[PDB]
Amino acid sequence: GAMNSSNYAELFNNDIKLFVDDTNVYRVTVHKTFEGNVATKAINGCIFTLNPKTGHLFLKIIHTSVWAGQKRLSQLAKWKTAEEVSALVRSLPKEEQPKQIIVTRKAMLDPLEVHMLDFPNIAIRPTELRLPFSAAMSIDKLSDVVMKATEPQMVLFNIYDDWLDRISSYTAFSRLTLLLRALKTNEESAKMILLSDPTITIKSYHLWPSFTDEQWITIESQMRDLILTEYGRKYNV
Amino acid sequence: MNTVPFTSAPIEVTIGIDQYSFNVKENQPFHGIKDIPIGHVHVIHFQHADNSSMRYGYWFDCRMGNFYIQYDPKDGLYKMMEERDGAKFENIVHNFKERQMMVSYPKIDEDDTWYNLTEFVQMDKIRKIVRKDENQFSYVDSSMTTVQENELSDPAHSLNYTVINFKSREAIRPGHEMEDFLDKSYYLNTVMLQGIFKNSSNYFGELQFAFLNAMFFGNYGSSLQWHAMIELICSSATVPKHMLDKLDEILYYQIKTLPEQYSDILLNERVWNICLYSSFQKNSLHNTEKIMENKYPELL
């Protein structure tokens, strides 16, 4: 059934699972036309498909040509997501295929179920958690590869950098969701916190800065402060 | 006009014949039902006064044999049986008629209700849904589960309705996932009509039989089937015009007949709201929408 606070350690057990977030698949800018009407222009998007135990992120870039001449794009985007996730599963060796796929938005349930009919033993599950994966396009290197794409493309990253050498998956996921929650809440401040100190760099092959354990505790505290601040600001407290 | 005699009525029971019903008291001298219209299937059904648990009954067609009812004190129910001795049967019937110990099928001449509820229902198709090949009539009760309910447990006592499942490989062509899920026309027209049912008359016959079993016996599984068969048509963008017009008539008479006090459980709010107001066919069921809005505006 639904994944929530009660069954949270299940994310880090040894049954392969993937989260799928479709928030950033269909992305538009809204603008005025010469006649004063409103129109949209699509920009490139992406499917965010993440193994929370390993940090493996299958980032399928959705190029705007996908939408050409199609109607009801927000509906189509859910089905295109499900088609691409099904294709990914089929491309993986049997021993790497997930036993569960958790969708971050319940509207993905039926599209994904229908596309996965050939996999009756893969459970398709919603979640009660409000996960901040929409903020993935606030990670500079992810946003850059999506915007530069000239055609459909899959790009493979570990979203945890090398953190699993020093911390458990549970702690890595908690750090990731904190960072993303902060970036979603106040992107400018969050990115300031992450880059304030010019001596800490991001390795070429990483997404996040190379913090020591002590610096990560400081950083994490700064992100909590930001989230609480923005909370009071937005809510006056 | 044909007759279903009763050997006796040893227990107090409400007896239904099609849409009619009457109470019989314990050991009241009741000996059956005469003047049953030839040309239609019929159902004779029972609810005991002392245990309303289990409504049960028998579907039959008097053109296929001479049938009578006899109470069995061991199994505790009224059983239909076939009399093979034609002279014995005509003699029995004539004597009970002479003593006026039978009720008359009370059909108003103006009244087409039973025809309209059974237009496509054939005994031969009933006998494939309800499998008991040694009898010419078919037993149905409240508890009997469907093949589809079983998949999700005695097979010989099951209602073998055609399985309809919108999230199934049968319903969804590889490569047309979104198309087939959002527009069920290929599942309706190719899989079900051309493939399984062969024609729309057989589809409507099963739809009508499912409704009647839901209404007369409170068979939950029959209720699910009726709604699935409606939803499959309404959720298809391409349906022959004669089928839509006939469906509108079929449903109109079903909604007209449904007891007002049973609508809360026999009418699925989601299916009916989707069918009348959201589906491809939201504008094709004028008679059904009008009666639903005047009779059950709450559900909607």
Ligand SMILES: NCC(=O)NC1(c2ccccc2)CCC1
């Ligand atoms: N965990 C990084 C790793 O060991 N391999 C990579 C990866 C594989 C599969 C999906 C995502 C990332 C890093 C690019 C290749």
Ligand SMILES: NCC(=O)NC1(c2ccccc2)CCC1
């Ligand atoms: N197994 C009998 C049964 O389930 N009867 C109920 C019913 C509801 C809806 C339609 C037909 C029957 C009355 C409560 C459920």
